[PDB]
């Protein structure tokens with residue numbers, strides 16, 4: 001396996017930091033002027049993570065259409081993803097407006113609400129069936145329907161109601177709960193299992209709007225999820241699987257959102273996940 005050879009060569013030479021910096025150097029730079037307007041300061045979690053103007057998701061309202069979210073459109077793989085920050089106390093209603101307007105079936109959450117003793121995102125979904133949430137600013141109601149708690153992830157069924165029209169939709173919430181506070185998982189087995197569970201739900205399929213994916217900033221863990229998915233889909237589709245270049249797929253994705261894959265360890269983990277996800281598709 002070529003990617004596996006490139007992998008053993010970088011590991012034996014200990015050059016992960018050098019490969020990573022080369023990607024940082026070659027990555028696209030596009031304007032983010034809407035993100036930086038003074039009216040939007042409390043809509044951004046991090047001053048250094050903004051959506052590009054060309055790929056940003058627009059809210060369908062005349063007041064202020066801004067949300068920190070990007071459309072990643074992968075033309076050859078035929079997959080689209082929305083990558084977004086963890087919602088803030090004043091953007092939870094905007095978040096559910098986006099899910100509604102973009103016709104998403106699934107939300108993928110890769111963080112815990114508290115990590116390293118600090119809040120990484122708002123408690124944006126209801127924890128009990130009989131205590132629903134109403135978002136008065138966007139006119140939406142959200143109800144917990146069911147919850148399935150497993151060792152490495154939790155799946156929830158949610159009902160989202162547009163209070164304006166009384167239409168309802170079922171949203172699936174896929175919550176990966178065991179990413180460690182520091183570094184990356186030792187084995188990619190539980191992350192690949194989780195990826196397969198999202199695929200099996202229909203959430204990534206072209207009959208729905210794009211999947212919404214987030215962590216805290218929406219670039220690191222979130223970047224790893226869409227990079228692994230896209231690379232495995234391309235290996236399934238092409239006559240020569242050996243031709244899939246993970247570094248070139250990552251640079252393509254960085255044309256749509258800055259900073260995807262935050263560390264040399266996240267880059268190495270993405271290689272491991274793709275290599276193992278291929279080894280098992282080589283014989284399940």
Ligand SMILES: O=C(O)c1ccc(Cc2cccs2)cc1
Pocket residue numbers: 001002003232235236241242243278279281282
């Ligand atoms: O790089 C290789 O040598 C290689 C990679 C993948 C395959 C077979 C696969 C096709 C699709 C997913 S795995 C064969 C050879």
